[PDB]
Amino acid sequence: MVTQLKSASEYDSALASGDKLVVVDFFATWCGPCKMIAPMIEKFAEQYSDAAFYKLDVDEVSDVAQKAEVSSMPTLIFYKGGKEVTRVVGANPAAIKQAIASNV
């Protein structure tokens, strides 16, 4: 399943009592994987049974991107215990399966 984070509440409450797998995606659609991998991760979303896909850009939100400083392209992270433990900031689809399928 794919989610759309419009309000910080959807993100905050997700890191609090969020035991399941909480995935985040920070990409301002510059040019490259950020747009080429969109279908990949978005497509894999229909593969998992309990994977929270949090989509975030920059201006569209301005809340998360503000606090959660981005240092990649794109920038994906995995939250299991309300704390970034298994992050994945690079560029590779397969990295989502072995990642999501792990924390799942």
User: How many domains is the chain partitioned into structurally?
Assistant: 1
Instruction: Report the alpha-carbon distance of residue 27 to residue 49 in Å, rounded.
Output: 24
Instruction: Report the alpha-carbon distance of residue 34 to residue 103 in Å, rounded.
Output: 23
Backbone φ and ψ for 23, nearest 5 degrees, come out as -100, 145
Please tell me whether residue 86 adopts helix, strand or coil conformation. Answer: coil
Which residue range forms the structural domain that includes residue 23? 1-104
Half-sphere exposure of 22 (CA within 13 A, CB side): 20
Instruction: Report the alpha-carbon distance of residue 18 to residue 5 in Å, rounded.
Output: 15
Paired tokens of 32: 């490259």
CB 76 within 8 A of CB 87: yes
| Residue 56: partners with Cβ closer than 8 Å, 6 or more residues away | 5, 24, 25, 26, 64, 65
Rounded to whole angstroms, the maximal C-alpha distance in the chain is: 35
Paired tokens of 37: 């991998």
Residues known to be catalytic: 31, 34
* CA 84 to each of CA 21, 29, 40: distance values in angstroms, whole numbers, following the listed order: 11, 23, 23
Backbone φ and ψ for 13, nearest 5 degrees, come out as -55, -25
Paired tokens of 34: 């950020």
Alpha helices in the chain (DSSP H): 8-16, 33-36, 38-44, 64-67, 94-103
